[PDB]
């Protein structure tokens, strides 16, 4: 017969329906776990491309008509590309090349947020700083983050115990290397009983040449030790071997006696 034909009203898209994955390279990257970054309508043909571009994610189908989102499942960041810096949280691989900027064929690989406090960077930075690749800023900041024991996870704390033992066995061979000098500096900064005892052990296990070159303030000659008794002030205050000496290579007794000096004012 005569059906009452009626066409539906003209549709109006929303913000979700107008999203384009080829524009959200700065939105999907800072996404965390259990976060649904709605990427919008996605054709079936581009699903493989968006899945190979963001491998750390899962393409979850949220709504009809191809409406999908990307859900973070993992942080696939290598140690050399995530540990030797403190500002980079992600990078892009393309033709076997790491880049900071984005390329439409590149692949996003991101770093754990505050990865240094997870301890995963200890093994890489232990070898990267011990050598000619030693960056003063990066390695000093890494030692600082290591002594930040309260901001680390349980994995971080056990890796920190292991790192303490490893640095102790390393710096006992030679403390003149820059990484061990910064480790002694931060052990001074910590200023606990364990830290002072560790400094003392590290400096006592040093070789005779090292003691003769660096520890002439802690180990004085017999003439200077005899002369130091003729004055009431501690030896370290007037001793020229303590006036100009690397403060990181002093024993804790000497480091403290250097502060007990009375300054005439």
């Amino acid at each position: 017969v005569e059906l009452p034909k009626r066409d539906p009203p003209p549709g109006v898209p929303t913000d979700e329906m107008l999203l384009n994955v080829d524009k959200m390279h700065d939105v999907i990257a800072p996404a965390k776990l259990l976060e649904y970054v709605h990427i919008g309508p996605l054709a079936k043909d581009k699903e493989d491309k968006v899945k190979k571009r963001y491998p750390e994610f899962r393409l979850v189908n949220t709504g009809p008509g191809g409406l999908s989102a990307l859900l973070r499942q993992s942080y696939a960041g290598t140690a050399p590309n995530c540990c030797r810096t403190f500002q980079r949280t992600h990078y892009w691989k393309k033709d076997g090349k790491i880049s900071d900027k984005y390329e439409e064929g590149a692949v996003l690989e991101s770093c754990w947020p505050d990865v240094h406090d997870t301890g995963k960077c200890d093994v890489d930075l232990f070898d990267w700083c011990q050598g000619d690749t030693f960056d003063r800023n990066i390695c000093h900041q890494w030692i600082g983050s290591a002594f930040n024991r309260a901001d680390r996870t349980v994995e971080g704390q056990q890796s920190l115990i292991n790192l303490y033992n490893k640095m102790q066995t390393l710096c006992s061979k030679d403390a003149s290397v820059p990484i061990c000098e910064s480790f002694l500096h931060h052990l001074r900064a910590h200023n606990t009983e364990d830290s002072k005892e560790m400094i003392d052990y590290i400096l006592r296990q040093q070789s005779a040449d090292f003691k003769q070159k660096y520890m002439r303030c802690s180990y004085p000659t017999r003439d200077k030790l005899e002369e130091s008794l003729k004055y009431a002030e501690p030896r370290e205050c007037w001793d020229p071997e303590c006036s100009n000496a690397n403060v990181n290579f002093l024993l804790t007794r000497n480091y403290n006696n250097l502060g007990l000096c009375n300054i005439v004012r």
Partner: nanobody
Amino acid sequence: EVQLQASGGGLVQPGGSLRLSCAASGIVFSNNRMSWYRQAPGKQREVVATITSGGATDYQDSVEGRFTISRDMAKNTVYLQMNSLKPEDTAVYFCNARRDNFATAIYWGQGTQVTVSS
């Protein structure tokens, strides 16, 4: 009239420890640098340890870390704790007191024998 009688010495095997004591009677530690000397038969005396009017301690490099010079102000007694004693440490250990700025007030005390037998 000034009493610096050292005591506590004796015979110990290598590695052993000894606590030497020197109780002053006529000298206040708040005015004097207190030193422990030793003298071995055949050689001259040498400073083993010292502590200023304040708790600032200093040690000879040969005995650094093995010896600890302590001070008790209420009892007015200076101690020397000797750990990991070696045969090189066999000597007569005695007390010494130098006034802070009087200089000429250098008082010595009777010694005590310390022997190590390998």
